[PDB]
Amino acid sequence: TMYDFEYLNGLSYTELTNLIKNIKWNQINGLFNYSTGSQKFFGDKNRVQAIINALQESGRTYTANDMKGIETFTEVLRAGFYLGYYNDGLSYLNDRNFQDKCIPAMIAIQKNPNFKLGTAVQDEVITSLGKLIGNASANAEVVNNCVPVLKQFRENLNQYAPDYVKGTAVNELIKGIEFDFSGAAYEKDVKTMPWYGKIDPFINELKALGLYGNITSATEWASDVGIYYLSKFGLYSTNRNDIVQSLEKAVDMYKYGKIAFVAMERITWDYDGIGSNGKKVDHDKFLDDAEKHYLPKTYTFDNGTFIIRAGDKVSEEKIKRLYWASREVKSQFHRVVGNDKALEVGNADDVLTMKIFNSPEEYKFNTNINGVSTDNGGLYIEPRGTFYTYERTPQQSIFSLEELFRHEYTHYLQARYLVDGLWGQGPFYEKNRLTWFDEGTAEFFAGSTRTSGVLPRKLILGYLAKDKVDHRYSLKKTLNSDSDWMFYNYGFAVAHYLYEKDMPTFIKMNKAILNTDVKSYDEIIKKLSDDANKNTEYQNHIQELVDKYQGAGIPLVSDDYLKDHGYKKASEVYSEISKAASLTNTSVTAEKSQYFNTFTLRGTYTGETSKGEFKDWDEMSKKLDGTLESLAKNSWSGYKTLTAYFTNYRVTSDNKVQYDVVFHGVLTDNG
Ligand SMILES: [Zn+2]
Numbered sequence: 314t315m316y317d318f319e320y321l322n323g324l325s326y327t328e329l330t331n332l333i334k335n336i337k338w339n340q341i342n343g344l345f346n347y348s349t350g351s352q353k354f355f356g357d358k359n360r361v362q363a364i365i366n367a368l369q370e371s372g373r374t375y376t377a378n379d380m381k382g383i384e385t386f387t388e389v390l391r392a393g394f395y396l397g398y399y400n401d402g403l404s405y406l407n408d409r410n411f412q413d414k415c416i417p418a419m420i421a422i423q424k425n426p427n428f429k430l431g432t433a434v435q436d437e438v439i440t441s442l443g444k445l446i447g448n449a450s451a452n453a454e455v456v457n458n459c460v461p462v463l464k465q466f467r468e469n470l471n472q473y474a475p476d477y478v479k480g481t482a483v484n485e486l487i488k489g490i491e492f493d494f495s496g497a498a499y500e501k502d503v504k505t506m507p508w509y510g511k512i513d514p515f516i517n518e519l520k521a522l523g524l525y526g527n528i529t530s531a532t533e534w535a536s537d538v539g540i541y542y543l544s545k546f547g548l549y550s551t552n553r554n555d556i557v558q559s560l561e562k563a564v565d566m567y568k569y570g571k572i573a574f575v576a577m578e579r580i581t582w583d584y585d586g587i588g589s590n591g592k593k594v595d596h597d598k599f600l601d602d603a604e605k606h607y608l609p610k611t612y613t614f615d616n617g618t619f620i621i622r623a624g625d626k627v628s629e630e631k632i633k634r635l636y637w638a639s640r641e642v643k644s645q646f647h648r649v650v651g652n653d654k655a656l657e658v659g660n661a662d663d664v665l666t667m668k669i670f671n672s673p674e675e676y677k678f679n680t681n682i683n684g685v686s687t688d689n690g691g692l693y694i695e696p697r698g699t700f701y702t703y704e705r706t707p708q709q710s711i712f713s714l715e716e717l718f719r720h721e722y723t724h725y726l727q728a729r730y731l732v733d734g735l736w737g738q739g740p741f742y743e744k745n746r747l748t749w750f751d752e753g754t755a756e757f758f759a760g761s762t763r764t765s766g767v768l769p770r771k772l773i774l775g776y777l778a779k780d781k782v783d784h785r786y787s788l789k790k791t792l793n794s795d796s797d798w799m800f801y802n803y804g805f806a807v808a809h810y811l812y813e814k815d816m817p818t819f820i821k822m823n824k825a826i827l828n829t830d831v832k833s834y835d836e837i838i839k840k841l842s843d844d845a846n847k848n849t850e851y852q853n854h855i856q857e858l859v860d861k862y863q864g865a866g867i868p869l870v871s872d873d874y875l876k877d878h879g880y881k882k883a884s885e886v887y888s889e890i891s892k893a894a895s896l897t898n899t900s901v902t903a904e905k906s907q908y909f910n911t912f913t914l915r916g917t918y919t920g921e922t923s924k925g926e927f928k929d930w931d932e933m934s935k936k937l938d939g940t941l942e943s944l945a946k947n948s949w950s951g952y953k954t955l956t957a958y959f960t961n962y963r964v965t966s967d968n969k970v971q972y973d974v975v976f977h978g979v980l981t982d983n984g
Contacts, residue, residue: 444485646758817927818837
């Protein structure tokens with residue numbers, strides 16, 4: 314049955330308390346709602362005093378099987394103070410002096426032999442006590458009587474901590490006592506409190522729990538709680554340095570684990586950053602030492618402009634592969650975008666740092682060290698010109714380290730060579746514009762190859778294999794985002810669609826973004842979205858992409874890249890390349906890397922009379938890719954390392970096609 318609130322007002326306290334004793338809390342209508350009916354109930358100081366006295370007698374008697382309705386009693390009194398906080402009508406409940414009337418009721422539960430945690434009743438009894446203290450008030454004597462529970466919980470930690478019920482019980486108990494105390498001395502001097510200096514046994518009880526040391530995956534949080542609340546309750550111990558010393562030991566115990574960071578946060582936030590010795594601890598040096606631990610190895614490429622700081626367990630082979638993959642993705646990008654001059658002088662992206670943790674587990678600490686999101690596969694922060702990720706097994710993620718490195722590398726390129734101004738800030742963000750584009754063209758460009766342009770990724774086509782009816786975004790629906798997870802895959806679908814079926818629009822888009830021509834880009838999104846035929850054209854493309862899944866591949870860096878190629882005179886490679894790609898006025902720079910040397914060769918290609926920018930682009934591609942493939946037929950193994958692109962399209966006074974052409978490959982001739 315359900316009991317109403319207007320009813321209870323018309324009862325004796327004797328019948329009311331025995332009624333509350335039998336019922337569960339949820340049966341009462343609008344118990345936390347403020348009404349004209351709930352006012353009269355809590356308005357009677359005698360009514361609530363009865364409920365407390367009933368709780369005190371109920372606390373003196375309760376057993377392992379019999380609740381004695383303590384759960385219900387607590388929640389009712391809790392509802393009172395809740396309403397007494399938000400409403401001027403029940404202001405006497407808000408007063409701390411009246412809340413002290415609950416203390417003998419709490420003590421009754423504590424002095425009862427059934428105060429230990431064991432049965433489902435005893436577990437939720439401690440739960441309801443802690444939840445009450447938060448809303449009511451406690452004193453030193455109430456606090457110190459919790460010690461038999463925390464000692465018991467610590468003594469059988471390995472069994473209890475993994476249990477939700479037993480765990481939550483102890484947590485809520487401490488969480489609640491801290492809650493009351495922290496509000497009780499809100500801006501008052503913490504030494505003026507009646508508990509200050511007497512809480513030693515409870516404060517020392519948190520030490521033992523927090524400094525348990527021999528912890529496992531299932532019990533870390535419990536010791537974590539211990540340390541966090543040791544700091545927060547350590548503000549009520551006369552010996553200040555005793556507490557800080559204990560926190561410092563917690564750092565040293567689990568050095569570079571979760572609790573270590575918590576303990577350090579506790580010293581800087583609660584104790585001003587002054588250690589037990591009396592001098593300021595170096596928070597920055599700790600974070601720096603923490604990073605060096607997880608990222609011990611360093612790999613440097615392109616004259617120290619491409620640095621990978623990686624975990625001790627990520628293969629050198631992978632490092633090398635990731636370097637070469639960046640070159641594959643880069644060249645495709647500059648081809649499509651038609652620019653390779655970085656947009657701004659002396660930015661942080663002048664040197665790209667890539668930090669790769671050993672595992673998702675080890676990746677989580679990145680948030681503590683570098684203060685960036687970790688609820689992701691990877692993350693590029695443009696103002697730092699740094700992007701973070703982790704090595705992964707196939708079972709941890711469907712995307713490999715190279716694949717995600719490639720998606721992220723695209724963002725580096727986008728921010729550097731395409732979108733003028735900082736990433737996320739600028740005209741192209743004042744309104745929602747490039748959300749589909751940034752993620753879309755990223756997944757797309759991650760499909761870069763050496764000689765085949767950009768190719769679909771099997772796993773992305775994998776995603777597209779799902780119910781056709783709705784779900785499949787409209788062209789207009791992709792162009793305009795707040796939506797669901799599939800946005801990256803249909804955003805890609807738009808990018809590939811344009812790349813394969815309508816390159817002019819795709820080039821015009823990129824040029825607009827490059828020239829920061831907001832009115833142009835918007836006109837393009839307009840024409841695409843207002844066109845029903847263009848959507849039908851797009852809807853068909855998705856089907857072709859789905860159809861390609863069977864014989865699709867995952868474009869990755871070839872093993873040929875890793876082969877020891879052998880010496881070839883540097884002059885020979887340049888001449889042979891210059892001749893092959895028909896380049897005039899050529900320069901070349903060389904650059905030292907960790908495992909090898911490399912050359913970037915620039916030049917001007919000038920062909921025959923133009924067929925129009927977009928036919929020209931299409932031909933140039935076929936031309937240049939062919940030059941890369943034919944060069945690879947030469948007996949020098951190092952020709953398979955070549956990547957090439959073309960930028961800055963124009964035509965001469967005689968309509969002859971003109972591009973700037975760039976070549977990049979391995980160099981085995983020294984100096
Ligand atoms: Zn992305």
